[PDB]
Amino acid sequence: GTTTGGKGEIQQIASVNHNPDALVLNYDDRPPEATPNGAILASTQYGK
Amino acid sequence: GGLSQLVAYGAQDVYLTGNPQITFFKTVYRRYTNFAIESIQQTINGSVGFGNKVSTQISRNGDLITDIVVEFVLTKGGNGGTTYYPAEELLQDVELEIGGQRIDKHYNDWFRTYDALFRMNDDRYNYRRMTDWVNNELVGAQKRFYVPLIFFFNQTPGLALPLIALQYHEVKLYFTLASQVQGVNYNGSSAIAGAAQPTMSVWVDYIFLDTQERTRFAQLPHEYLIEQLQFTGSETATPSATTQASQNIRLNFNHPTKYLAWNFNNPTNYGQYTALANIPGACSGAGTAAATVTTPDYGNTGTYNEQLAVLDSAKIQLNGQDRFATRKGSYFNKVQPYQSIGGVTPAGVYLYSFALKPAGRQPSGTCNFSRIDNATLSLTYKTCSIDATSPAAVLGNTETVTANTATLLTALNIYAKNYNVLRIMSGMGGLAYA
Amino acid sequence: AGGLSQLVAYGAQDVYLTGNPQITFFKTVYRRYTNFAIESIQQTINGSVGFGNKVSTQISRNGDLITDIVVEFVLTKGGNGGTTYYPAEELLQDVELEIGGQRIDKHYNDWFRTYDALFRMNDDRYNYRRMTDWVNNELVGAQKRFYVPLIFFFNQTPGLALPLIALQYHEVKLYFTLASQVQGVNYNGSSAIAGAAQPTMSVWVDYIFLDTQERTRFAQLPHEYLIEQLQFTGSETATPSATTQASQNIRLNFNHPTKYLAWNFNNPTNYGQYTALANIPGACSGAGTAAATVTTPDYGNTGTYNEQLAVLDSAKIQLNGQDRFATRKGSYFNKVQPYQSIGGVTPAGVYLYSFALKPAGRQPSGTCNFSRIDNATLSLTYKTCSIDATSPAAVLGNTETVTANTATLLTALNIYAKNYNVLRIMSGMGGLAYAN
Amino acid sequence: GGLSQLVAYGAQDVYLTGNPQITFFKTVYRRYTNFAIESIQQTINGSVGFGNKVSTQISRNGDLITDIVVEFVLTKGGNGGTTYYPAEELLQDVELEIGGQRIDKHYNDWFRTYDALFRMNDDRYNYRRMTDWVNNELVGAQKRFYVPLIFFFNQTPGLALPLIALQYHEVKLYFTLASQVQGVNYNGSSAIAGAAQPTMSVWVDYIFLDTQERTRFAQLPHEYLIEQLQFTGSETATPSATTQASQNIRLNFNHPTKYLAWNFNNPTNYGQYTALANIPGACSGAGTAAATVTTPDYGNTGTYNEQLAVLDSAKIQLNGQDRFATRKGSYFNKVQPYQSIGGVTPAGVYLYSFALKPAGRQPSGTCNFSRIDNATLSLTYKTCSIDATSPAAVLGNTETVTANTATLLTALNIYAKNYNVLRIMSGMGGLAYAN
Amino acid sequence: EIGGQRIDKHYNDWFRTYDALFRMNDDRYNYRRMTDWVNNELVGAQKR
Amino acid sequence: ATSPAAVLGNTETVTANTATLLTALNIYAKNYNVLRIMSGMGGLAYAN
Amino acid sequence: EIGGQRIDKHYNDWFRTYDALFRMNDDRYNYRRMTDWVNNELVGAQKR
Amino acid sequence: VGFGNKVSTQISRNGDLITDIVVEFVLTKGGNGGTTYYPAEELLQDVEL
């Protein structure tokens, strides 16, 4: 009747089989590129 | 006197004062950097009006940004009791973008849910004063409302956005204004003739750093542990007077999650998280001959009267197994907030935390849904058999039933709050995990 | 112009604020933490749930550490709104905390009421009331689930989570006493309410599941957790006379480093009644009208802030026969003490005297060690009960040294002391560092 | 169960639990020094009564001092609704002096402004309980009031004043009692016949240190970072019933200022920061035939109805130039305290912080007026065109207008709170910076 | 529950569905005899 | 449903009008898992 | 306009001219269906 | 743009140097001749550089 006090609930084996990573993207994979932010450069589109 | 206590020393004191480490009677203040703060108006692009989408690019006046308050000027379309947090309702949503990447996005309902759950006491009251009319104002009354934003950088300087370290990225806020605001341009389904269009302004509080702090921000890489909101709308298993509705909602969430929060509502009436009834405050005209349980007392739309809440019980399942034992709706409405927030949550608003202290900034425990194949929220609803027009039935009833009008709470909004990292380097940035 | 105009305005007086900077406000570094999870698990309740019955539970060991404990009750209203007052609190007559067969602590329904009266506040207090009472004018026959959180040291902070994992050979139990009667639920004053339902009870414990390394350390290492305990005794009140000022010297049979003392005067007839009854709004059943009586409280408004109905005129605490502080008025203990030490508002009839800078927190901040005091005495002077309680003018217009004639009903006194002990855990067993 | 969450572990947890630094389940309390706290009555010198100047020297009973509470006994000269925080009103001002050097000074109005901005919820209510009658007490009622002081050392143990290290300097408190207190000895301008004079007692809570800590405080030099209140009264560019007034009030401030605070008021009625009106609580008799918009409902003097306040907009200039964009009066009344304090500020009371956390002890950004030649508080006032006796006009009006009775708010009180250094050396002290 | 872990759970309807599919003949009848009244018992009848 | 001629004599693709009362659907599945016991304690090998 | 300078510009008449010359068959109809009312819609009819 | 609104413009980098700046407005009369006074000047409440 050894469990007169208590014993810790054992851990199960939770295996992720599906694909729950379908909305994320690693920053170390697709790093963000530059975009303008107010310091617009010259309108050099003044061709010959 | 004081000495008769001081002298009472002994073995039991060693754990409190032996080998002292601190005192309480001399505070060492920490020299901080030289910085200043300024409130600067941003320019809103587009046409401001009900139902329109407008936006702003946050200017580079300072080095870092924190608090953002959106001002709105509205006029009452009717008398006192007709509006409910109308400036909150008006700002339908706000989307936060850095370099074209969506960092976060809030909804008017989130602001209502968030406030209902996490603000409290006088802060909550003062908040109401900035978004509604709370002194029994009458038709035509004009007020400027201030809607603070609640993005991570709008809550703590510790997470101020380093515009300075983003030399190559635009930073924007996109604001959607509601097509209608109750008691301002519409009254229930009716339009209010002559209602004025809103005037809007976005204010950003910018931090100016001194020379060395400024240089470090501009040149060093940064990693900010920040908050994000996840949100999807769902259809509520329609409550019934004949049987208890039940539902199993897959939770399409990801990332380490601090907590889940949700509410049920009648989408017709902003903030109507509970059923309507003929008891004081619970419906338009409650208590008299003119009472109706089809329209709320708008000024008192929210309530703490759980008898009008529809949820009977709930649990969260992970990959088919219960995460915790099923608890009553009242457990998620009152206990979770007691344990985790310390505020008082309105009926119809629920919280389940995965964190020890979800109301704070530090990640005191999270549930990573990116590693859970199937997270599901399981709900059981009350039987909506109480005749809402009869106080004896409304107030003298049992645990598993609610007002018949609860059947109209057909919308379900499920939110999740998670932690991500905003990485900034070489003048540009984005999230560690999309 | 703008914020830059402030930064440039820098001189000698700025050096003591920002020279040689140590910190910033714009770079918060959050500390990485261990991997853990929280689960709310229903416990087995042994015994028989009912009014006046005792029940008990052995906390299961599903998780490794425990914190929050909530007792759920389902009660019904035996009368209309205004007839109950925190009935879930009245029902939970007392709770004993036991480890390995040894009592660690014990709280009482009155303590829960006193604790709340002093330490909870604002919306916390309101939400707290929502979980223990009917606050929306519910009517007779209404049924509601109440949640009464326990407030033992491990039930207030994760910092003191009880290491059940390290207590392998000691069972941990909670023992509960349910009140024989609960106002507005099964009795209306002395009259039983026919048909009153028995309570339904459920005890929930929130468990912490630790990952491998943190769990292993807790399981194997000895621990010393600095904890709180509540000392409590009931005493007869030197009930004030309507002719004079009663006085009393109560020896305080307390021990250990005490954070604070707290006390109240009450009428055991009515749970939570710490003040006199009167025909002033909220101070009695029917107050304000012809039907008013000052023999029965407005139960839904049992507690007040109207100190005119309180009975303590003044008090001092003696230690080893020496005055600890100059004698102060009852209102000093009721209003100033908690202003300074807690920051909330304390109801009339409830008094606090702190030996600590911040008694509301966990961190020790000064204590009175009664294990070195042979004569700790609480000296109380009561107000004269000469005011005709049935005449609101008599009450509302009275003076400092007097109270209601109905204040003589407050015949019982509750004196509490909250102290610090150490819970030592080693080799699968625990115990306290100090017995006395 | 809970284990199913623990196992949900992957790359996104690296920032939260990888290389863990702390736990939450093994709290560490810091061991502290041995001390005791005693509340000891000081002797108040001088004649106590309305309008009198009194003072006390704080005895060196303990080693350090923190809280100070002044007790007063006042009686009601009329029924409920006739008083408003009367013990606060009674203590007209308090000065703190060390060695003859003035350190600081509080005013009854400051206590009200301070409270309006920084106390909150039940703290604010409890405070009211210690300074007023809040249970509908009637004429003849008697109460002991407790007015805590709010000098820098009265708010935190961290700034406990080291009387032990001030061996050659005496420390005094000077207190001015008001000539009149509403609902106690006067009802508006009318004296109340038979009114009682107040009873006063000053209490200081002392810290008794153990030997090692006491020795260090007594012998070592100290530099305490302290708060000071700067204050001047100004005339208000009172708005008309026609045009909007404007004003640029030169701010004679010095030192690294945490924040400015201000209010407009009617000097006759303590705590009146808004216009009177015939709406419930906004005037004596409001809501009925007897309503008078010339006298407040004193017990309900304070309100959150900003419509009755007079500030349209304001800005602060430094060196003749805008410090921030002009904002509306409601910004300074509702948003500033939302952002910086977290309580609810009553109508007519305004705050502008130069600091991130103005409600705290720790410095968090200041405006150093010792390096500013000129600065002004620039104000624009609302038009006083609303008939205060008509709720339709009072409650259905526009953003830029207020009550015709708002022109009674002719006084302006501008406060500033800054940080200085209190130096205690060789048994003596004073402040590091004169200006 | 074993060791604090849910192992399984049955429902009244499952017992009915299970029976409908897997019990049979006299095995099913005998089962019915233990859960219902099958000899035309009348109001007030008591059964184990 | 109240007319046996209609109830007993009808086609394969139809049923009773009272069949609309069967609004609840109960779906069950029975599977295998492994209950492991070791060193005096046990629980399931797989969670999902 | 790119970089502050006009790169090109179309006119309503050009859209009509362009269509007249370069769209055809059901492409032309699909286009017309997105710019006009072609199902005998009546006064007050609303169309995106 | 409208009455009471705050609007702004960033000057494009089309040329190398800039001088004259003219703000155009189109307004309508809400009354007859004699009812307006420099209304476009009044309208441009302010401009910040």
CSV table of N, CA and C in Angstrom, one decimal, chain C residues 1-2 6 10 12-14 16-17 25 31-37 39 65 122 158-159 208-210 214 218 305-307 324 326 328-329 331-332 334-336 339-340 343-346 362-366 396 398-400, chain D residues 1-2 6 16-25 27 29-30 32 35 37-39 67 71 119 121-123 126 129-130 135 138 141-144 146 203 205 255-256 322-323 354 356 363 366 368 370-371 419-420 433 435:
chain,number,residue,atom,x,y,z
C,1,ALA,N,14.5,73.4,-29.8
C,1,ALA,CA,13.2,73.1,-29.4
C,1,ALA,C,12.9,71.6,-29.3
C,2,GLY,N,11.8,71.3,-28.6
C,2,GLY,CA,11.4,69.9,-28.4
C,2,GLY,C,12.3,69.2,-27.4
C,6,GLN,N,15.8,69.7,-23.8
C,6,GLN,CA,15.9,69.3,-22.5
C,6,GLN,C,17.3,68.7,-22.3
C,10,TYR,N,22.1,70.8,-19.6
C,10,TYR,CA,22.8,69.9,-18.7
C,10,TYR,C,23.9,70.7,-17.9
C,12,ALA,N,25.6,71.1,-13.4
C,12,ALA,CA,26.1,70.4,-12.2
C,12,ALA,C,25.1,69.5,-11.5
C,13,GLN,N,23.8,70.0,-11.6
C,13,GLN,CA,22.8,69.2,-10.9
C,13,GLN,C,22.3,68.0,-11.6
C,14,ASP,N,22.8,67.8,-12.8
C,14,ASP,CA,22.4,66.7,-13.5
C,14,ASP,C,23.4,65.5,-13.2
C,16,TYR,N,24.4,64.3,-10.5
C,16,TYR,CA,23.9,63.3,-9.5
C,16,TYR,C,22.8,62.5,-9.9
C,17,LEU,N,22.2,62.7,-11.1
C,17,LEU,CA,21.2,61.9,-11.7
C,17,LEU,C,21.6,61.1,-12.8
C,25,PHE,N,16.6,53.0,-19.2
C,25,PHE,CA,15.2,52.6,-19.1
C,25,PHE,C,14.7,52.0,-20.4
C,31,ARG,N,15.2,38.0,-17.7
C,31,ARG,CA,15.9,36.8,-17.3
C,31,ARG,C,15.3,35.5,-17.9
C,32,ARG,N,16.1,34.7,-18.5
C,32,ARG,CA,15.7,33.4,-19.0
C,32,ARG,C,15.4,32.5,-17.8
C,33,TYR,N,14.4,31.6,-18.0
C,33,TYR,CA,14.0,30.9,-16.8
C,33,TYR,C,13.9,29.4,-17.0
C,34,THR,N,13.6,28.7,-16.0
C,34,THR,CA,13.4,27.2,-16.1
C,34,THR,C,12.1,26.8,-16.9
C,35,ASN,N,12.1,25.6,-17.3
C,35,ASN,CA,10.9,25.1,-18.0
C,35,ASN,C,9.9,24.5,-17.0
C,36,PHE,N,8.7,25.0,-16.9
C,36,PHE,CA,7.7,24.5,-16.0
C,36,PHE,C,6.3,24.7,-16.6
C,37,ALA,N,5.3,24.1,-16.0
C,37,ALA,CA,3.9,24.2,-16.4
C,37,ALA,C,3.0,24.1,-15.2
C,39,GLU,N,-0.9,23.1,-13.7
C,39,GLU,CA,-2.1,22.3,-13.9
C,39,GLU,C,-3.0,22.4,-12.7
C,65,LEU,N,5.7,20.7,-7.5
C,65,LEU,CA,5.6,21.7,-6.4
C,65,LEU,C,4.1,22.2,-6.4
C,122,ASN,N,-9.3,47.5,-3.5
C,122,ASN,CA,-9.8,48.0,-4.7
C,122,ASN,C,-10.5,46.9,-5.5
C,158,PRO,N,4.5,31.8,-5.9
C,158,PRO,CA,5.2,30.7,-6.5
C,158,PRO,C,6.6,30.5,-5.8
C,159,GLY,N,7.1,31.6,-5.3
C,159,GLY,CA,8.4,31.7,-4.7
C,159,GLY,C,8.5,30.7,-3.5
C,208,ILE,N,2.7,22.6,-10.1
C,208,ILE,CA,3.8,23.0,-10.9
C,208,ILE,C,4.6,21.7,-11.4
C,209,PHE,N,4.7,21.6,-12.7
C,209,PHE,CA,5.4,20.5,-13.3
C,209,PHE,C,6.7,21.1,-13.7
C,210,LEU,N,7.8,20.5,-13.2
C,210,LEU,CA,9.1,21.0,-13.5
C,210,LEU,C,9.8,20.1,-14.6
C,214,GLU,N,15.6,21.0,-13.1
C,214,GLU,CA,15.0,21.7,-12.0
C,214,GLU,C,14.3,20.7,-11.0
C,218,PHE,N,15.2,19.7,-7.1
C,218,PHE,CA,14.3,19.8,-6.0
C,218,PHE,C,14.1,18.5,-5.2
C,305,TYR,N,-17.4,51.6,7.3
C,305,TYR,CA,-16.3,52.4,7.6
C,305,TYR,C,-16.6,53.4,8.6
C,306,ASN,N,-17.9,53.4,9.1
C,306,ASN,CA,-18.3,54.3,10.1
C,306,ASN,C,-17.9,54.0,11.5
C,307,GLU,N,-16.7,54.5,11.8
C,307,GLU,CA,-16.0,54.3,13.1
C,307,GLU,C,-16.8,54.7,14.3
C,324,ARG,N,5.5,49.6,24.2
C,324,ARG,CA,6.1,49.5,22.9
C,324,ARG,C,6.0,50.8,22.1
C,326,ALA,N,3.7,54.9,22.2
C,326,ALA,CA,2.7,55.7,22.9
C,326,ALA,C,1.3,55.3,22.6
C,328,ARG,N,-2.3,55.1,21.3
C,328,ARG,CA,-2.9,55.8,20.2
C,328,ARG,C,-4.4,55.4,20.2
C,329,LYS,N,-5.2,56.3,19.5
C,329,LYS,CA,-6.6,56.1,19.4
C,329,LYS,C,-7.0,54.9,18.5
C,331,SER,N,-8.8,54.8,16.0
C,331,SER,CA,-8.8,55.2,14.6
C,331,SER,C,-7.4,55.2,14.0
C,332,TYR,N,-6.4,55.3,14.9
C,332,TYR,CA,-5.0,55.3,14.5
C,332,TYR,C,-4.6,53.9,13.9
C,334,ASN,N,-7.0,51.7,13.0
C,334,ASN,CA,-7.9,51.4,11.9
C,334,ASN,C,-7.6,52.1,10.6
C,335,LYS,N,-7.1,53.4,10.7
C,335,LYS,CA,-6.8,54.1,9.4
C,335,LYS,C,-5.4,54.4,9.1
C,336,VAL,N,-4.6,54.7,10.1
C,336,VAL,CA,-3.2,55.2,9.7
C,336,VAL,C,-2.3,54.0,9.5
C,339,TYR,N,-2.8,52.7,6.2
C,339,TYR,CA,-2.4,53.7,5.2
C,339,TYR,C,-0.9,53.5,5.0
C,340,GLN,N,-0.1,53.5,6.1
C,340,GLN,CA,1.3,53.4,6.0
C,340,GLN,C,1.9,52.1,5.6
C,343,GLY,N,-1.6,50.3,2.3
C,343,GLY,CA,-2.1,51.1,1.2
C,343,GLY,C,-3.5,50.9,0.8
C,344,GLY,N,-4.3,50.1,1.6
C,344,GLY,CA,-5.7,49.9,1.3
C,344,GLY,C,-6.6,50.6,2.3
C,345,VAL,N,-7.8,50.2,2.4
C,345,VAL,CA,-8.7,50.9,3.4
C,345,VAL,C,-9.2,49.8,4.3
C,346,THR,N,-9.1,50.0,5.6
C,346,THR,CA,-9.6,49.0,6.6
C,346,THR,C,-10.9,49.4,7.2
C,362,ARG,N,6.0,39.6,1.3
C,362,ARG,CA,6.7,38.4,1.7
C,362,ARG,C,8.0,38.7,2.4
C,363,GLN,N,8.7,39.6,1.8
C,363,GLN,CA,10.1,39.9,2.3
C,363,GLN,C,10.0,40.5,3.7
C,364,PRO,N,10.7,39.9,4.7
C,364,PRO,CA,10.8,40.4,6.0
C,364,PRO,C,11.2,41.8,6.0
C,365,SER,N,10.5,42.6,6.9
C,365,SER,CA,10.8,44.0,6.9
C,365,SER,C,10.7,44.5,8.3
C,366,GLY,N,11.1,43.7,9.3
C,366,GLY,CA,11.1,44.1,10.7
C,366,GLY,C,10.0,43.2,11.4
C,396,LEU,N,-24.9,59.8,14.3
C,396,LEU,CA,-24.2,60.6,13.3
C,396,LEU,C,-23.6,61.9,13.9
C,398,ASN,N,-22.5,62.2,17.1
C,398,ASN,CA,-21.8,61.9,18.4
C,398,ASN,C,-20.3,62.3,18.4
C,399,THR,N,-19.7,62.1,19.6
C,399,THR,CA,-18.3,62.4,19.8
C,399,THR,C,-17.3,61.3,19.7
C,400,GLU,N,-16.0,61.6,19.9
C,400,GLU,CA,-14.9,60.7,19.8
C,400,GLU,C,-14.9,59.5,20.7
D,1,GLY,N,-2.3,16.8,-19.4
D,1,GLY,CA,-2.0,17.6,-18.2
D,1,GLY,C,-0.9,18.5,-18.4
D,2,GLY,N,-0.3,19.1,-17.3
D,2,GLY,CA,0.8,20.0,-17.3
D,2,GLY,C,2.0,19.5,-18.0
D,6,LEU,N,5.1,21.0,-21.0
D,6,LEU,CA,6.5,21.0,-20.8
D,6,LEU,C,7.2,20.4,-22.0
D,16,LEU,N,13.5,32.0,-24.1
D,16,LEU,CA,12.8,32.1,-22.8
D,16,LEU,C,13.3,31.1,-21.8
D,17,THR,N,13.7,29.9,-22.2
D,17,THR,CA,14.1,28.9,-21.3
D,17,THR,C,15.5,28.3,-21.6
D,18,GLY,N,16.2,28.7,-22.7
D,18,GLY,CA,17.5,28.1,-22.9
D,18,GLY,C,18.4,28.8,-21.9
D,19,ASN,N,19.5,28.0,-21.5
D,19,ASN,CA,20.5,28.6,-20.6
D,19,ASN,C,19.7,29.4,-19.5
D,20,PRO,N,18.9,28.8,-18.7
D,20,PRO,CA,18.0,29.4,-17.8
D,20,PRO,C,18.8,30.1,-16.8
D,21,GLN,N,18.3,31.2,-16.3
D,21,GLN,CA,19.0,32.0,-15.3
D,21,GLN,C,18.4,32.0,-14.0
D,22,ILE,N,17.0,32.0,-14.0
D,22,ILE,CA,16.3,32.0,-12.8
D,22,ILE,C,15.2,31.0,-12.7
D,23,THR,N,14.7,30.8,-11.5
D,23,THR,CA,13.4,30.1,-11.3
D,23,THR,C,12.5,31.0,-10.6
D,24,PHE,N,11.3,30.5,-10.5
D,24,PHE,CA,10.3,31.2,-9.8
D,24,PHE,C,9.9,30.5,-8.6
D,25,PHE,N,10.4,29.4,-8.4
D,25,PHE,CA,10.0,28.6,-7.3
D,25,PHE,C,10.9,28.4,-6.2
D,27,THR,N,12.3,31.4,-4.1
D,27,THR,CA,12.6,32.8,-3.8
D,27,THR,C,13.7,33.0,-2.8
D,29,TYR,N,15.0,35.6,-0.1
D,29,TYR,CA,14.8,36.8,0.7
D,29,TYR,C,16.1,37.3,1.1
D,30,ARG,N,16.3,38.6,1.1
D,30,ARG,CA,17.5,39.2,1.6
D,30,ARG,C,17.5,39.3,3.1
D,32,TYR,N,18.3,41.2,6.4
D,32,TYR,CA,18.3,42.6,6.6
D,32,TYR,C,18.8,43.1,8.0
D,35,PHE,N,16.1,46.3,13.4
D,35,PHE,CA,15.6,47.6,13.7
D,35,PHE,C,14.2,47.4,14.3
D,37,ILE,N,10.4,50.0,15.0
D,37,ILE,CA,9.7,51.3,14.7
D,37,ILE,C,8.9,51.8,15.8
D,38,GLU,N,9.1,53.1,16.3
D,38,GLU,CA,8.2,53.5,17.4
D,38,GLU,C,7.5,54.9,17.1
D,39,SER,N,6.3,54.9,17.4
D,39,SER,CA,5.5,56.1,17.2
D,39,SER,C,5.5,57.0,18.5
D,67,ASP,N,7.9,58.3,8.6
D,67,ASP,CA,6.6,58.9,8.6
D,67,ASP,C,6.4,59.9,9.7
D,71,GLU,N,-2.0,64.9,14.0
D,71,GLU,CA,-3.3,64.6,14.3
D,71,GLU,C,-4.0,65.9,14.6
D,119,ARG,N,-2.5,59.8,-5.3
D,119,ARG,CA,-3.0,58.7,-4.5
D,119,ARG,C,-4.1,58.1,-5.3
D,121,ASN,N,-7.5,54.9,-5.7
D,121,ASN,CA,-8.3,53.8,-5.4
D,121,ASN,C,-8.6,53.8,-3.9
D,122,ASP,N,-8.4,52.7,-3.1
D,122,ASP,CA,-8.7,52.7,-1.7
D,122,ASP,C,-7.7,53.5,-0.9
D,123,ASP,N,-6.5,53.8,-1.5
D,123,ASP,CA,-5.5,54.6,-0.7
D,123,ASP,C,-6.1,56.0,-0.6
D,126,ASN,N,-9.1,55.9,1.8
D,126,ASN,CA,-8.6,55.8,3.1
D,126,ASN,C,-8.0,57.1,3.6
D,129,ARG,N,-10.8,59.3,4.5
D,129,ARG,CA,-11.3,58.9,5.8
D,129,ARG,C,-10.5,59.5,6.9
D,130,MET,N,-9.2,59.7,6.7
D,130,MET,CA,-8.4,60.3,7.7
D,130,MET,C,-8.4,61.9,7.7
D,135,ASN,N,-19.2,59.4,6.3
D,135,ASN,CA,-20.2,58.5,6.6
D,135,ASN,C,-21.5,59.2,7.0
D,138,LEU,N,-23.3,64.3,11.1
D,138,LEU,CA,-24.1,65.5,11.3
D,138,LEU,C,-23.4,66.5,12.2
D,141,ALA,N,-20.7,66.5,15.2
D,141,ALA,CA,-19.9,65.3,15.2
D,141,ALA,C,-18.4,65.7,15.4
D,142,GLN,N,-17.7,64.8,16.1
D,142,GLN,CA,-16.3,65.0,16.4
D,142,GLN,C,-15.4,63.9,15.9
D,143,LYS,N,-14.3,64.3,15.3
D,143,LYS,CA,-13.4,63.3,14.7
D,143,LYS,C,-11.9,63.7,14.9
D,144,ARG,N,-11.1,62.6,15.1
D,144,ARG,CA,-9.7,62.8,15.0
D,144,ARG,C,-9.2,62.5,13.6
D,146,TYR,N,-6.1,62.4,10.7
D,146,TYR,CA,-4.6,62.2,10.7
D,146,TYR,C,-4.1,62.7,9.3
D,203,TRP,N,3.0,63.6,15.5
D,203,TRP,CA,3.7,62.3,15.8
D,203,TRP,C,4.7,62.0,14.8
D,205,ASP,N,7.3,58.8,13.5
D,205,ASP,CA,7.7,57.4,13.6
D,205,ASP,C,9.2,57.2,13.4
D,255,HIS,N,16.5,73.8,-10.6
D,255,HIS,CA,16.8,72.4,-10.3
D,255,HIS,C,16.2,71.4,-11.4
D,256,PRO,N,16.7,70.2,-11.5
D,256,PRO,CA,16.3,69.1,-12.3
D,256,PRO,C,14.9,68.6,-11.8
D,322,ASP,N,8.9,75.9,-27.9
D,322,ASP,CA,8.1,74.7,-27.5
D,322,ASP,C,8.9,73.5,-27.0
D,323,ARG,N,8.6,73.0,-25.9
D,323,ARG,CA,9.2,71.8,-25.3
D,323,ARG,C,8.5,70.5,-25.9
D,354,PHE,N,8.3,65.4,-17.0
D,354,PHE,CA,9.5,65.4,-17.8
D,354,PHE,C,10.2,64.1,-17.6
D,356,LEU,N,9.8,59.6,-16.9
D,356,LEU,CA,9.1,58.4,-17.3
D,356,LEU,C,8.2,57.9,-16.2
D,363,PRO,N,14.9,58.7,-9.9
D,363,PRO,CA,14.9,59.6,-11.0
D,363,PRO,C,14.7,58.9,-12.3
D,366,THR,N,14.6,64.4,-16.1
D,366,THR,CA,14.3,65.7,-15.5
D,366,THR,C,14.6,66.9,-16.4
D,368,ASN,N,16.1,70.4,-16.3
D,368,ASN,CA,16.9,71.2,-15.3
D,368,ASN,C,16.7,72.7,-15.6
D,370,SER,N,17.8,75.0,-14.0
D,370,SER,CA,18.9,75.8,-13.6
D,370,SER,C,19.7,76.2,-14.8
D,371,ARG,N,19.4,75.6,-15.9
D,371,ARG,CA,20.1,75.8,-17.2
D,371,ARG,C,19.2,76.4,-18.2
D,419,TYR,N,14.7,67.2,-7.9
D,419,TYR,CA,15.6,66.4,-7.1
D,419,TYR,C,16.9,67.3,-6.7
D,420,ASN,N,17.2,67.3,-5.4
D,420,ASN,CA,18.4,68.0,-4.9
D,420,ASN,C,19.1,67.0,-4.0
D,433,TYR,N,22.5,72.2,-3.5
D,433,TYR,CA,22.3,73.3,-4.4
D,433,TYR,C,21.3,74.3,-3.9
D,435,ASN,N,20.2,76.8,-5.8
D,435,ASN,CA,19.3,77.1,-6.9
D,435,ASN,C,19.4,76.0,-8.0
